[PDB]
Amino acid sequence: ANMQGGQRLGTNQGKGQSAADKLALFLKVFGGEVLTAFARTSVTTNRHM
């Protein structure tokens, strides 16, 4: 069935830590691109003096 003694890098373990989260020790990284608000276009520039 399930493997015995498998290496668990994510589990926090520790003396006082809960270790309930299986992904605790892993940390998030920056995504590829920063999200920016959509550009707003000017309409009146060529419509008056």
Binding site: F30, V34, T36, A37, A39, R40, S42, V43, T44, T45, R47, H48, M49
Partner: protein, 246 residues
Amino acid sequence: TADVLIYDIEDAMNHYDVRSEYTSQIGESLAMAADGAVLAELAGLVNLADSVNENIAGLGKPSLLEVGLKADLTDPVKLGQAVIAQLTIARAALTKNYVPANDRTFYTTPDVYSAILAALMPNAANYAALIDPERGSIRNVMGFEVVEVPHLTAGGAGDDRPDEGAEATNQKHAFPAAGGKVNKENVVGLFQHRSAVGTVKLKDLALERARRTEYQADQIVAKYAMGHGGLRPESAGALVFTAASA
């Protein structure tokens, strides 16, 4: 002026670059104030008092026009037919003042822009005209060229920066919220001719960068100096909902 201040300690902890995008937003914020001021100046001509409607008495009137009661006209296709039928009168009202044909534009919200699209769909229209259904774009309805702008009922810049929904403390070119004519509560569109609004520019637009050592922060500021005013009120116009009976 639009400016931003970036602290060095927060920039160090940051994992991405913000300086390149910030200059785009502060520069674009200045351009959005020009659109708000120009359109508010166009609505300013229609809001001219009864004593001062005309440049010289006998030249032409701003014209107001009416589309419906906004309660019976809530349906999308019903609103679209009202606008299309009333853009014909707007063409006539502008012609009665000898305003030249062509160089005529109609500024409307995207909501009303889609109302015209629904009116000319195969379900409603007996034959195809104007719009292109594949791209959802309506083309040159009458002499007017239909332009959709989300930022109507938005005025020019003012002293201090409003939060999100707050109003500027002193706004030079403002769109009336509850004014007598073509105010913010019942507005459908603004139609106008090339010679209806003017802008006067000094200094063009400039971008500046500064170093604030005492605060350990960098600074970027964008700035221009322009003036917006309404000229030739006879070229102005509007489309508004009928005032609710009280």
